[PDB]
Amino acid sequence: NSPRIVQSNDLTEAAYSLSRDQKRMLYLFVDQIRKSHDGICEIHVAKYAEIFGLTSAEASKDIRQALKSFAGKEVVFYRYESFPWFIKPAHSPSRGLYSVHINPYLIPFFINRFTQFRLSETKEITNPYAMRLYESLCQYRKPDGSGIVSLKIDWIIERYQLPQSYQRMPDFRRRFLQVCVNEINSRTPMRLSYIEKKKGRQTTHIVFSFRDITSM
DNA sequence: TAATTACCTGTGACAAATTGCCCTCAGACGG
DNA sequence: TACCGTCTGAGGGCAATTTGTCACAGGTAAT
Ligand SMILES: [Mg+2]
Numbered sequence: 001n002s003p004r005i006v007q008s009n010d011l012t013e014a015a016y017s018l019s020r021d022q023k024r025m026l027y028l029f030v031d032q033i034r035k036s037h038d039g040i041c042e043i044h045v046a047k048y049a050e051i052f053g054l055t056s057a058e059a060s061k062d063i064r065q066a067l068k069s070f071a072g073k074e075v076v077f078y079r080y081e082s083f084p085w086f087i088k089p090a091h092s093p094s095r096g097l098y099s100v101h102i103n104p105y106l107i108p109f110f111i112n113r114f115t116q117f118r119l120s121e122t123k124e125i126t127n128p129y130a131m132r133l134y135e136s137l138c139q140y141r142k143p144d145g146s147g148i149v150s151l152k153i154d155w156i157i158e159r160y161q162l163p164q165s166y167q168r169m170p171d172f173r174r175r176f177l178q179v180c181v182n183e184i185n186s187r188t189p190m191r192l193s194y195i196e197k198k199k200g201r202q203t204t205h206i207v208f209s210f211r212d213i214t215s216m
Numbered sequence: 217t218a219a220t221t222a223c224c225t226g227t228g229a230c231a232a233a234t235t236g237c238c239c240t241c242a243g244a245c246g247g
Numbered sequence: 248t249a250c251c252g253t254c255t256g257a258g259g260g261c262a263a264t265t266t267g268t269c270a271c272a273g274g275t276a277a278t
Contacts, residue, residue: 020234045256046256055236055237056254057238057257057258059256060255060258061257064257094244095243096244096255096256126234163267163268165268165269166267168268169224170224171268171269173226174226175266175267175268179265179266200223201224201225201275
């Protein structure tokens with residue numbers, strides 16, 4: 001089939017800002033970690049390239065820039081507690097191979113109240129906020145492949161660390177919500193719809209229902 | 217009744233970031 | 248054992264799209 005990512009809901013719902021490339025590598029880190037405690041993971045350019053249909057060159061570029069873009073990035077678990085992703089710079093012992101040092105204090109948060117999806121399910125998504133949304137929906141996914149969940153807008157904004165102009169709702173709709181629904185519906189197997197929940201003039205939650213394209 | 221205010225909404229416009237894409241050239245390796 | 252061609256990937260760039268930010272116009276209700 002394809003690699004099965006599983007992760008604690010606390011990571012699905014953590015507050016952080018990562019790019020697509022960084023989240024993709026992070027999925028591979030979570031897989032390596034799950035196999036076995038040292039916090040040391042490894043990524044091969046050619047393996048990354050084959051997984052995500054990239055060139056060796058563009059794989060190398062994506063890995064390198066994601067990796068140097070991790071510096072200063074932080075992850076927040078709201079039970080809040082903030083951690084750095086990396087506790088040592090990445091480095092390449094051999095050409096085409098990178099070794100990275102994830103904060104070992106993060107190990108128990110990566111590994112019964114959990115979220116799971118196959119990597120082929122997410123590897124064509126481009127917008128990182130749409131990967132965050134697809135992970136949050138997976139957290140509520142039933143065996144058959146459908147689910148329903150109400151997410152609060154403030155919680156969406158804080159958890160996905162959406163940029164400030166998306167606190168203006170028409171921009172939230174236009175540049176995040178609609179784009180990620182279209183992206184998920186066109187690039188994943190999940191078939192996603194939504195409806196808006198209001199309180200007075202303000203929209204407070206977004207209600208997601210979804211099904212799997214193995215059904216009608 | 218009318219005008220101003222305090223909310224919301226959508227879209228046009230621009231800036232900034234991100235995309236897959238292109239070209240160069242050395243390291244590793246095997247032939 | 249030694250040289251060179253090939254594949255790899257570590258770099259430099261790119262224009263076309265996507266994303267992020269804001270001015271502006273319209274609607275409504277409170278006042
Ligand atoms: Mg790239």
